[PDB]
RNA sequence: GUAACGGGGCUAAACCAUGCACCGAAGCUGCGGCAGCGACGCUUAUGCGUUGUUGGGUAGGGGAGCGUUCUGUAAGCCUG
RNA sequence: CCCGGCGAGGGGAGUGAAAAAGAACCUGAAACCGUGUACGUACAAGCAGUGGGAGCACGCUUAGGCGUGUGACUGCGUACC
């Protein structure tokens, strides 16, 4: 019953991820896209 | 008198050489 | 909102800094060269951490060697006679002994050559 | 007792000046006047002036008689510099640097 | 006068009076601990045995402290493939002090 | 520039057959420490025990954290 | 007040809580450049470290010995993206 007492229920508040922030994150340097091609590029897609 | 001021000039190059054969030409 | 990156990054230059003492020339000035010196100690010390128990080894067998052939038999008939007479001092201890104790190591040759012939 | 004379913005390259400052580095002060008085170098007045001025220092606060007094410490340090411009063949410009110098010495009767 | 024994899967080499570093031992920090087994003891005659420990031998100690030792580094790095670790470590260790090596 | 044993050197320190020793790796064993996944018990819920087994890693997937600047708790608390 | 070219720059004195707040003026990091002290270095071949290791100097200590700095000689070892 104090503003600094109230807490969210467990398994409710995910981080997210940030691409590109080193090597411990396990997301750095390409942020998950592989190497060279049409889908690695920014923008880069096909129709549906 | 015991001041100093300057200023400063970037004109770069203007490039156009290399007036002997090409290296490796046809 | 903004953040400043001022305070942070001078604490880890200053990190990597302080262990590279010692080292020569720009290796111990600029922080570029300074953190690939500081990653290569580290993998040799592991890697040495390792070859410190072989190097140890190889230097007591080589002054058991010799102890023994000044005794009059080699180092191979010598530990052979100690395993059949049921005798369980390692390299290091004997290795000391000869160096320290000229008569204790006598007695213990003597007993090897007793139980191998 | 030591005593402290100095030359802030001394318009000469500090490089130049150490080669005369250790010339003197340690001796008495009257043999250090006649040394400096024959070593035909720009740099040897300014240091020349400099060590007057501390012995002047030297006697008239502190106590007096200049007749005991060595050549402790001397340095050279580098001062701000000015930046001007040279010009150069086919358009190009070059950057000039005009170096500067502090110079301190110090005395002592000790 | 010098005995051998053997505790942490290792062999020492001690005498009277004197302090030893072994690996961690459950023991409290007063009482005193007991080595059963000995390899060798010699005092102008070597009683060295045939058999491994000698028959009627002990030695006599007691605890004085426990520790950690300093901190060592680990570092693990592969060329130019994006990859490398680190930790960290210290290791436990238990002093005693002999005094007693009875023949 | 020896230059077609790594060298020195070797008539056995070469080759064939038989035999017994020893050296030799981050493999295996001994001692201490950490973590993951199961099975079985206790709590009979978090958790706590008994064990068995696992822990090289790029692209990539999954799970837990540290620190920075702003808002509340803040006319509170620290500080000449 | 003193040195100096009736200079530039200093050294005293004085103001101020503070001048290492003196106008090139809050605080004043890094690269870069110097002076002083301890140790090493002029018969020795290579990513300059890492494992072992005498000797010397300083400090503590009640010997025992520790701690800090330097490091002869020796095994292994061809930067990063």
Redesign the interface.
Request: aromatic letters at 0%; zero cysteines; charged letters at 45%.
């Given at each position: 019953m104090r503003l600094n007492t109230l807490s969210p229920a467990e398994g409710s508040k995910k981080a997210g991820k940030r691409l590109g922030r080193g090597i411990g994150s396990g997301l750095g340097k390409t942020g998950g896209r592989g190497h060279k091609g049409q889908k690695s590029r920014s923008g880069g897609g096909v129709r549906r | 008198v015991a001041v100093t001021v300057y200023e400063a000039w970037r004109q770069l190059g203007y490039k156009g050489s290399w007036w002997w054969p090409r290296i490796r030409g046809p | 909102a903004r953040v400043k990156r001022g305070v942070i990054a001078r604490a880890r230059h200053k990190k990597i800094l302080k262990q590279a003492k010692g080292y020569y020339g720009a290796r111990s000035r600029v922080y570029r060269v300074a953190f690939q010196a500081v990653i290569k100690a580290g993998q040799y010390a592991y890697r040495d951490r390792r070859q410190r128990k072989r190097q140890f080894r190889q230097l007591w067998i080589a002054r058991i060697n010799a102890a023994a052939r000044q005794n009059g038999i080699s180092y191979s008939k010598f530990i052979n006679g100690l395993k059949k007479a049921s005798v369980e001092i390692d390299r290091k201890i004997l290795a000391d002994i000869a160096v320290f104790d000229k008569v204790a190591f006598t007695a213990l040759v003597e007993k090897a050559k007793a139980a191998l012939a | 007792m030591e005593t402290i004379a100095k030359h802030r913005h001394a318009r000469s390259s500090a490089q130049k000046v150490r080669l005369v400052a250790d010339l003197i580095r340690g001796k008495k002060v009257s043999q250090a006047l006649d040394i400096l008085t024959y070593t035909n170098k720009k740099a040897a007045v300014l240091v020349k002036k400099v060590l007057e001025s501390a012995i002047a220092n030297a006697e008239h606060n502190d106590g007096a008689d200049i007749d005991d007094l060595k050549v402790t410490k001397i340095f050279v340090d580098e001062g701000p510099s000015?930046?001007?411009?040279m010009p150069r063949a086919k358009?190009?410009?070059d950057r000039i640097l005009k170096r500067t110098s502090h110079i301190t010495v110090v005395v002592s009767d000790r | 006068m010098y005995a051998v024994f053997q505790s942490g899967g290792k062999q020492h080499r001690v005498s009277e009076g004197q302090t030893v570093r072994l690996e961690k031992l459950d023991i409290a920090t007063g009482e005193t601990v007991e080595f059963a087994e000995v390899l060798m003891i010699a005092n102008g005659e070597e009683v060295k045995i045939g058999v491994p420990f000698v028959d009627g031998g002990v030695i006599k100690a007691e605890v004085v402290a426990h520790g950690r030792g300093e901190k060592v580094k680990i570092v693990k790095f592969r060329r130019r493939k994006h990859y490398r670790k680190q930790q960290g470590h210290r290791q436990w260790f238990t002093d005693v002090k002999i005094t007693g090596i009875s023949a």
């Open positions: - | - | - | 000015m930046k001007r411009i358009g190009r410009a | -």
